Amino acid sequence: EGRFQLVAPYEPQGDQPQAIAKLVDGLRRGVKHQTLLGATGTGKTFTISNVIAQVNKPTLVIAHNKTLAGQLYSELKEFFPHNAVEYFVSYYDYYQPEAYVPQTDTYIEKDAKINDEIDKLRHSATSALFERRDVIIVASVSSIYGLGSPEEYRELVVSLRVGMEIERNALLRRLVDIQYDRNDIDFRRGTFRVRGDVVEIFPASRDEHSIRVEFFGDEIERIREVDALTGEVLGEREHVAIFPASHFVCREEKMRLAIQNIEQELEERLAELRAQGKLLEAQRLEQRTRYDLEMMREMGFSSGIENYSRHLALRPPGSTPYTLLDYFPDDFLIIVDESHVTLPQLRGMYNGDRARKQVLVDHGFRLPSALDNRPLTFEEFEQKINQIIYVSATPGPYELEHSPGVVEQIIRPTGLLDPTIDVRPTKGQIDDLIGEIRERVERNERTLVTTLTKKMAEDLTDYLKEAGIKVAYLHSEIKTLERIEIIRDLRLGKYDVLVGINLLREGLDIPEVSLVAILDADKEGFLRSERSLIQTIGRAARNANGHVIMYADTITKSMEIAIQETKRRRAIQEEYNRKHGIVPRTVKKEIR
DNA sequence: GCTCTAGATTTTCATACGGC
DNA sequence: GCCGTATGCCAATCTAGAGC
Ligand SMILES: Nc1ncnc2c1ncn2[C@@H]1O[C@H](COP(=O)(O)OP(=O)(O)O)[C@@H](O)[C@H]1O
Ligand SMILES: [Cl-]
Ligand SMILES: [Cl-]
Ligand SMILES: [Cl-]
Ligand SMILES: [Mg+2]
Ligand SMILES: [Mg+2]
């Protein structure tokens, strides 16, 4: 039980308050699917926060990337400073999955490294849902990939209360059983130790805050929070729950039967493959499957154990995997940030995973039961939904098709206007641009350019430097850390222009940008779709002199729709401005 | 209708080796 | 067997075109 406490220095404004009211009505009435159509710069997060606070439900927000995810997490940390705002993503620094490519007859070995901090946050995410109700989890599609059952997860928690009767070494056993390691020398998270009559435990969800449990004989006299760094106390606890240090827990009891069932599966497919004269394939499967089974009878954990998931959980074949979704209560809520991308990405996750595994199975690398170790299908994602709100400036088909209408939110609280749009011929285009950029330089304004290919962006960048202009390029070859710099440098003014391809769109706040130039606008394709064009136009929406130049010789079906949608925004906006008598001011935003 | 291209994101229960 | 350490740049996915 709990209660969201929204904290903000502003009240809802513009299209916000009607949007808030409509979405909340929808939710109370029981509408499953809804769509917030929020123009860029209208403050959708904040709209959404109001909605969360009014309906008071643990909510999951799915983002399509870790940058955005990061930001939402940070934004919502500030809006809900007394509540459990949490983070859930892949915790792998690098990961390469097991795979076989028939076209090259190449097998690739699994390779992976784990980030400790994300692992921690994931444990802080799952535990949080069992302790309290005022929870928001900002997640990637990592939330449709498999976890161990949450009912098993909950039941293995070690409860610890003042007055409890409990033997010390039993507690130690139990901590061990739930994947805590003893460590006296190096007391980091996922560990415990003893110092006399006190047992120190470092929850799997914590970085800088240990639990210090003081014992009498078999009685816990007191329980205290402790700074990992310093060592001082930081609170007196009556009780505290220690959750497992892993989301999967194998238990010896049932591991035995699991092995029989695997060995039985092995025989049957080996036979099946020989019967078909796939003799090398059976040789493979035999060789590895037995090696893995060896390590499950000597040790507990074998390499790629996850392939034997469904067997080790003793569940029937074709079984749906438990995921984070199941860790929420039944009446939870889901927000889907940038739904037009996140949902396709979501749909796609299973397809890649299944394509990959079907091959490994076909060519004798893994058993058919490997395929039951998977993310959710989109169809299963749908059934797990309780209610949901797709947020996006350019909602895709699925959203529109499943939502009553849209809740629209085009009026920005700062009173800013969707930019004006010129269309110009490709003849002499880059000279046109160079001049047009120089004008912007003179008024301390910045310019974004998009092109269709990485090399065109680099060439253009080199020919821009050539003309005296200060510029850098920006595409996927550049590492995420360096990007933040590049952009920081643009805002600062080290650069006056930035040339990109497809990273100059959703999520990008730069109010120093007064101009956005979309080259080859007529070249139809994913870089110049209805939606892509609209999203790139938005980059100029955070400036009073915001302007967009599409360089083309024709006007495609997409440009048609973009010019109209924008035009329409600019009118409704300018109307509301003329009523309230507002003079648009460019977004004052701190750059460091 | 098949096959290829573009830029860009995400996901995946670490493990092979050696020296006790 | 039990440890601590060195180690990776390798897949298939998405949308929406081009070229035969
Ligand atoms: N009701 C409001 N009054 C004043 N400022 C607001 C309000 N709602 C949001 N803002 C501010 O406007 C800024 C821009 O909104 P933003 O979240 O970038 O829009 P979106 O992310 O939906 O495109 C935010 O940093 C936010 O602090
Ligand atoms: Cl399930
Ligand atoms: Cl060019
Ligand atoms: Cl050029
Ligand atoms: Mg409206
Ligand atoms: Mg945003």
Author numbering: 2 to 593
The publication says:
Within this complex, UvrA acts as the initial damage sensor but hands off the lesion-containing DNA to UvrB and dissociates, leaving UvrB bound to the lesion in a preincision complex, the precise nature of which is not known. Both UvrA and UvrB expend ATP to form the preincision complex, which is believed to require threading of a β-hairpin element on UvrB through the DNA duplex. UvrB presents the lesion-containing strand to UvrC, which catalyzes hydrolysis of the 5th phosphodiester bond 3′ to the lesion and then the 8th phosphodiester bond 5′ to the lesion. UvrB is classified as a member of SF2 helicases on the basis of conserved helicase motifs (I-VI) (Supplementary ).
We therefore introduced a mutant Cys residue into the hydrophobic pocket and disulfide-crosslinked the resulting UvrB(T251C) protein to a single-stranded DNA substrate containing a thiol-tethered nucleobase, a cytosine. The complimentary strand is designed to contain two pyrimidine-pyrimidine mismatches on the immediate 5′ side of the modified cytosine; these were introduced to destabilize the duplex in the region expected to form a bubble, thereby facilitating maintenance of the helix-penetrated state for the β-hairpin. We determined crystal structures of UvrB disulfide-crosslinked to a 20-mer duplex substrate, in both the presence and absence of ATP, at 2.6 Å and 2.8 Å resolution, respectively. For those crystals grown in the presence of ATP, we clearly observe a nucleotide bound to the ATP binding site located at the interdomain cleft within helicase domain. However, the electron density corresponds to ADP plus inorganic phosphate; hence we conclude that the ATPase site retains activity in our crosslinked complex. As expected on the basis of the synthetic crystallography approach used to trap these structures, the 13th nucleobase on the inner strand, a cytosine, is extruded from the duplex and inserted into the hydrophobic pocket between domains 1a and 1b. As predicted, in our structures the β-hairpin loop was found to be fully inserted between the two DNA strands, clamping the inner strand between the β-hairpin and domain 1b (Figures 3a–3(c)). Though insertion of the β-hairpin loop requires disruption of only one or two base-pairs at the insertion site, our structures reveal disruption of base-pairing throughout the entire 6 bp duplex region comprising the crosslinked cytosine. The outer strand also makes contacts to UvrB, but these comprise almost exclusively van der Waals interactions. In agreement with previous EM studies, the UvrB-bound DNA contains a sharp bend (~60°) localized at the junction between the bubble and the fully base-paired segment flanking on its left side (“left flank,” Figure 3d). If so, the observed contacts between the helicase motifs engaged in DNA binding and the inner strand phosphates suggest that our structures obtained in both the presence and absence of ATP (hydrolyzed to ADP and Pi in crystallo) represent “open” states.
